[PDB]
């Protein structure tokens, strides 16, 4: 089955979501990286408050969620400082 | 209020040498003594009315240069010749005698088809290419040598003792053929050089000016002695190699200029850069002094800075705030409240009392910091630099011996002698982590107030009889004082690292060579328009003169801006390429999420536009450090032949590529952009639109609206993921931006390396790409084969403008099979985007569009 966009745009394969090219206008084909200018991405953070950030952060380097699960292909190593 | 600063008839020498008027020369050269030696040609010159003897050495040198060297005979004491300024001995070229006669010796560079005509009786030398006239050196008459004799003067409250009496010396070149000339920074004045016959001459004098005026010659921070000719015909550069004080005058007499040197001491020492084009003129000019340091890429990002951010948690809060207002930045600089009452190397021990755990939190944002270093030591027998200093006899001294003390920042201080090799050698010692304690990789440095400014000094500096290494006064080097203070701060950053990281500094005062240790800025502008509108001319001088790294104070240093200025000031720093947010002591905070929301986002577009163009300006200062090109350029670089171009300094060009027109008038609504170029095409890179050249367009602007054109037949490379800052970006794929020529072709490079060592050089880890397109194909190949890099950056995209739709897109790369790209293609705008090429960008590969 092929992906929709959230907002009703495009129709784009199955195989281009998460595939780091921003597809759509409202960059929901990309929730789990950098590539959309206005994506985010969802910290799940268990042990505290969960948290959205910008796409832009996904894999930049800096701890942004305290999970540490938006830095997963960077070098940088983030512990979990959610307790 | 500017009786603090003297003109040319309160300046004893000036005065003296402008009194000379154009007339026959007393000199006249002993043809009898003429030598061809190895490397040169001597000659004796003799005064006729005073009997002096002078020796003119007269060299041809490699790549197409003369040097002339004056000196005296037999002098008394020697004459100062400038060190540490030539990057290397230029190598000569063998001269020949082609032709005499009673009056007369024709010179050959090498076979050639350069020519140089000695006259005897007057002095007077001609240059030729074959049988056109140049330029010539004397024509006027107006050569001046004051031998030093077996005296003391008075400005304001300061005397100078002057115990070597008059010893000033002077000279004037004819420029047939040339009407406009540039250069001589710093002044804040136009880009195209006015005559100085009815006024002041330009002034070369390194100075620390209070509020300085627009559109006058007055004397600034820094002093680069290189004039650079240009006409229709041809380009031609002088430099004048003399670190004391000096004055040029400008005068137009078929059309010709005629420039006049006029320096207080040292020996007569210029180069003829002969061209023809004006990048032969930069080539000339880098194989003398060198090339601009290729910065760190953070450095090439976005500063913010004030005087002064109060303590660590205001820096931590200038820090978030950036990216609670998704805005990014780089650098956060720390001004002299940072320090212990102005003594540098030192911390505030209440408002910056851990150091290493403020770098530590702005390394976990990936950002840097700025602290400044000034080179005026407090005299305090409990500042162990003051100490040490004193004790090892590394300050500069007076004529009685002792230690010369005057007034700055922390009260009474003391001046560290910076031409004294060794007290450099310590100085870039003290960069070390253990001597500079609570500095980090992640802490680069910002050297001011290096003219040096004295408070109670005349003219705000030091005293001309003050004594240096070697016995020389302060006369003799001044102009080459900051750029000591810069080559030692950035050596010490090299150090520190053991060799291995890029230095980032920041200098007020320079001097030719000053580009190989980083960046300068125009010091104390103000928050007026006008002041805005001036960045241009004086950037662009600077770049001229190989100073490419160079920038104004965003925003204005004085008095509070408007929201609107400031918008437009942004705008404007984001193409400049040193790109500094900084403000006086007693103005409003301007962060620029302070400011209504219409006004933060022009803002941050700016912001956006920079760091998605860094790709594209880390490139053009790799050409810069390897070639002597200047990154910023006006807009007669790029068209030699478009006269109406000679004068222009609202517009400027980045590189080839990009033409830019900021907004600098209040509640406009509209441009006049000169788009030049015959059968050459602009693209609008805001709506896409395609312009023929040349013609002037009108082109209406918002708040938001920063003109900017792409050329036809050039390649954009950007990083279209903006972060927080460019640590967070260097590994991320770049988008290439195709403009086709009309005839359909386009060619662009691409530099890439760690972002901050010296392992392009030591190691030859680096790419340089070039990217060419031509029929219906874009090619990806090696423009340097030496270079090779582990990186992840592949091509994630490529917008085409001016192409129709395709059938069908064809990818194909070196180990991979072909591959089919989709693209959407808009009718209107005649843009072609090519969806994820996928390539990594250290490959070769094609893209056809069938
Ligand atoms: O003439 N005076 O008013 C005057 C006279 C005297 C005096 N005192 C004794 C005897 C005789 N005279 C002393 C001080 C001043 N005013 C000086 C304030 C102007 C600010 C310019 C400085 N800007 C520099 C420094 C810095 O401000 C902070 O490091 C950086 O932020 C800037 O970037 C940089 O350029
Ligand atoms: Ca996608
Ligand atoms: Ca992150």
Known sequence: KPFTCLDGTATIPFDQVNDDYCDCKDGSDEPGTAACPNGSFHCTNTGYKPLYILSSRVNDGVCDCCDGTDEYNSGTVCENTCR | ?850
């Not at chain 2, 407090?378 to 011996?401: A, F, I, M, Q, W």
């Not at chain 2, 006064?473 to 900051?482: F, K, M, P, V």
């Not at chain 2, 204005?556 to 942004?570: A, Q």
């Not at chain 2, 441009?671 to 002037?696: A, C, F, M, N, R």
């Open chain 2, 1 to 850: 209020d500017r009786s603090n600063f003297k003109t040319c008839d309160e300046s004893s020498f000036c005065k003296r040498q402008r009194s000379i008027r154009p007339g026959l020369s007393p000199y006249r050269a002993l043809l009898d003594t003429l030598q061809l030696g190895p490397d040169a040609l001597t000659v004796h010159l003799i005064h006729e009315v005073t009997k002096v003897l002078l020796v003119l050495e007269l060299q041809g040198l490699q790549k197409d240069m003369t040097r002339i060297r004056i000196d005296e005979l037999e002098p008394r004491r020697p004459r100062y010749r400038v060190p540490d300024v030539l990057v290397a001995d230029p190598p000569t070229a063998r001269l020949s005698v082609s032709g005499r006669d009673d009056n007369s010796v024709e010179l050959t560079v090498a076979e050639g088809p350069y020519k140089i005509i000695l006259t005897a009786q007057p002095f007077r030398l001609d240059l030729l290419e074959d049988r056109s006239l140049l330029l010539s050196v004397n024509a006027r008459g107006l050569m001046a040598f004051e031998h030093q004799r077996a005296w003391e003067e008075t400005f304001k409250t300061h005397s100078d003792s002057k115990p070597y009496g008059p010893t000033s010396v002077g000279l004037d070149f004819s420029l047939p053929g040339m009407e406009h000339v540039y250069g001589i920074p710093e002044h804040a004045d136009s880009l195209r050089l006015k005559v100085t016959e009815g006024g002041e001459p330009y002034r070369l004098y390194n100075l620390d000016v209070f509020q300085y005026e627009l559109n006058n010659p007055m004397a600034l921070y820094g002093s680069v002695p290189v004039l650079l000719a240009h006409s229709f015909h041809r380009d031609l550069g002088i430099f004048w190699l003399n670190a004391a004080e000096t004055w040029v005058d400008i005068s137009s007499n078929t059309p010709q200029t005629d420039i006049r040197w006029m320096s207080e001491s040292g020996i007569i020492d210029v180069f003829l850069m002969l061209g023809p084009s004006v990048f032969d003129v930069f080539r000339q000019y880098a194989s003398l002094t060198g090339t601009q340091a290729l910065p760190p890429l953070f450095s090439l990002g976005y500063h913010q800075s004030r005087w002064n951010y109060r303590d660590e948690a205001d820096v931590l809060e200038v820090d978030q705030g950036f990216d609670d207002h998704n805005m990014p930045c780089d650098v956060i600089w720390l001004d002299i409240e940072h320090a212990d009452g102005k003594r540098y190397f030192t911390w505030d021990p209440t408002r910056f009392p851990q150091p290493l755990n403020m770098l530590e939190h702005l390394a976990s944002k990936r950002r840097k910091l700025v602290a400044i270093v000034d080179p005026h030591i407090k005299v305090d027998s409990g500042y162990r630099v003051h100490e040490e200093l004193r004790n090892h006899g590394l300050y500069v001294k007076t004529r009685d011996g002792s230690d010369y003390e005057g007034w700055c920042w922390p009260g009474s201080a003391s001046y560290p002698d910076f031409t004294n090799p060794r007290m450099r050698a310590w100085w870039s010692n003290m960069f070390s982590f253990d001597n500079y304690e609570g500095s980090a990789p992640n802490l680069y440095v910002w050297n001011d107030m290096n003219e040096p400014s004295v408070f109670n000094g005349p003219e705000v500096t030091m005293l001309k009889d003050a004594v240096h290494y070697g016995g020389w006064e302060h006369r003799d080097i001044h102009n080459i004082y900051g750029l000591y203070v810069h080559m030692a701060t950035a050596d010490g950053l090299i150090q520190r690292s053991g060799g291995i990281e890029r230095p980032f500094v920041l200098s007020r005062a320079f001097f030719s060579g000053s580009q190989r240790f980083g960046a300068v800025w125009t010091g104390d502008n103000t928050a007026e328009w006008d002041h805005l509108k001036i960045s241009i001319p004086m950037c662009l001088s600077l770049a001229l003169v190989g100073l490419s790294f160079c920038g104004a104070d965003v925003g204005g240093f004085f008095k509070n801006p408007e929201p609107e200025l400031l918008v437009r000031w942004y705008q404007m720093g984001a193409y400049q390429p040193f790109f500094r947010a900084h403000a006086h002591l007693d103005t409003g905070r301007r962060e620029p999420w302070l400011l209504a929301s219409q006004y933060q986002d022009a803002i941050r577009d700016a912001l956006f536009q920079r760091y998605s163009l860094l790709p594209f300006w880390y490139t053009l200062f790799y050409q810069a450090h390897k070639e002597g090109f200047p990154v910023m350029r006006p807009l007669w670089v790029q068209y030699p032949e478009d006269m109406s171009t000679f004068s222009i300094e609202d517009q400027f060009m980045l590189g080839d590529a990009l033409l830019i027109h900021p907004v600098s008038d209040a509640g406009a609504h509209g441009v006049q952009v000169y788009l030049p170029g015959q059968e050459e095409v602009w693209y609008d890179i805001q709506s896409y639109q395609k312009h023929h050249g040349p013609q002037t367009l009108y082109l209406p602007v918002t708040l938001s609206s920063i003109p900017v054109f792409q050329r036809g037949g050039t390649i954009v490379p950007r990083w279209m993921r903006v972060r927080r800052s460019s640590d967070c970006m260097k590994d991320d794929p770049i988008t290439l931006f195709v403009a086709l020529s009309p005839q359909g072709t386009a060619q662009g490079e691409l530099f890439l390396d760690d972002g901050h060592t010296f392992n392009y050089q030591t190691r030859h880890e680096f790419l340089l790409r070039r990217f060419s397109f031509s029929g219906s194909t874009l090619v990806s190949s090696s423009a340097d084969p030496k270079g090779h890099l582990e990186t992840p950056i592949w091509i994630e995209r490529v917008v085409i403008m001016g192409a129709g739709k395709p059938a069908a897109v064809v990818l194909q790369t070196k180990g991979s099979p072909e591959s089919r790209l989709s693209f959407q293609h808009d009718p209107e705008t005649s843009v072609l985007i090519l969806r994820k090429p996928g390539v990594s960008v250290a490959s070769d590969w094609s893209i056809h569009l069938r």
